[model samples]
Target chain A: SMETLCQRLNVCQDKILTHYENDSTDLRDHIDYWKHMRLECAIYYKAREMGFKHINHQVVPTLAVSKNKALQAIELQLTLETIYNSQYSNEKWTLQDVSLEVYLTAPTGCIKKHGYTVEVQFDGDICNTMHYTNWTHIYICEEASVTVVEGQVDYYGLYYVHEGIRTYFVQFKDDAEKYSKNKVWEVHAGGQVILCPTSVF
Target chain B: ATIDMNFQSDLLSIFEENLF
Candidate 1:
């Protein structure tokens, strides 16, 4: 006997006929859903292949909430006063323009959150040209409440961001000390870290 | 003072290749 009892069922032909006969609006909606699913699958697959462990649920939601709150707070704060500048060694570094954006994760919690606070400070580079130092400071406090204080820098000033790494050393005063030395912290962002989608076979 | 300049050329090459 043959492998099939009756006839060879043409899958492509059946799909074509079904698609053609279906309502145009329904077809369009299906197409959109498929596209979104495909994109999400691709993201997940790429992330997995790159050895990116899924963000812990506890860490994810906390950072997400904190980030949204921080953005709103900072936006209001920036409108009132500009960020302060720092003096490096003997050079008096003036604060140019500061812009902070909700990169990676938007207002929606669709994109996973990297548990770190980010602030970009534009200062004159070594060549005396305007350049930005993207600072990503990690949350050290047990609670998600981040206090924007001056004078406590972290790690040789190297914190981790999505792509590579960044560091923002806050300057804070301790007891009789006027200005605490720059400390360093690290952050790891998922920029180059590719994630694969679950839908992709 | 005699300093050992031991280096892993193979590892270095691999690192260079994957740097980008």
Candidate 2:
């Protein structure tokens, strides 16, 4: 059924496999499998509806191992509903290790809007102030452009946005001077975007 | 492998029939 559905929908099985994490209990395994199946199916169909072909799936481990894991995870899920649900229930659930590096690549000839919210800090103390800027749009080129932003390991300045309205400068490991000003650091070469700590200036 | 049952009936029903 997964094969048929994936074939009919052009869903990347590898992509669906990556979303399943901590597959411990039987119930959790099934839930996560179906969840990612629906998710990846929706994403592929939506992107196709928008006229993007997106037919490739590149994963960390080879496709063979990922396929095995997918089967095991879903089997865990199946055991929950079939046997465990009627029989037993209840249960509990990565490292320097391999991870999926998420990169947002726009469809060719598409103009996407991107923005950032910056915060100001003084004397290593947050001044409780921020600057919410407008969306800066840029056109995607015909050649493949890689913008790696999702789970980057090293960002120069430490920043986070939470509660939908606050962006704060938690701390900076080094290069404090680089982020001391209120300028947008848009470096596309390595797909790094940083908003300087404007509170200092 | 003999002990492993083929329980993909429900899996097929949900994924194949309902979703797709």
DockQ per candidate, 2 decimals: 0.01, 0.05
Candidate 2: clashing pairs of residues: A30-A77
Largest TM-score belongs to which candidate? 2
Off by over 4 Å in 1: A1-25, A55-201, B1-20
TM-score of each: 0.15, 0.22
Task: Judge the docking of candidate 2 as incorrect, acceptable, medium or high.
Answer: incorrect
**What tier of docking accuracy does candidate 1 attain?**
incorrect
TM-score, predicted candidate 2 vs. hidden true structure:
0.22
User: Which 10 consecutive residues of model 2 chain A have the lowest summed lDDT?
Assistant: A94-103
Q: What is the lDDT of candidate 2?
A: 0.34
Error of 1 at A43 (Å): 0.3
lDDT of 2 by residue, A57-151 (tens): 42233434434444443433333334223322343211001111101222112222343433333224344233332223322222233121221
Q: How high is the CA lDDT of each candidate model?
A: 0.26, 0.34
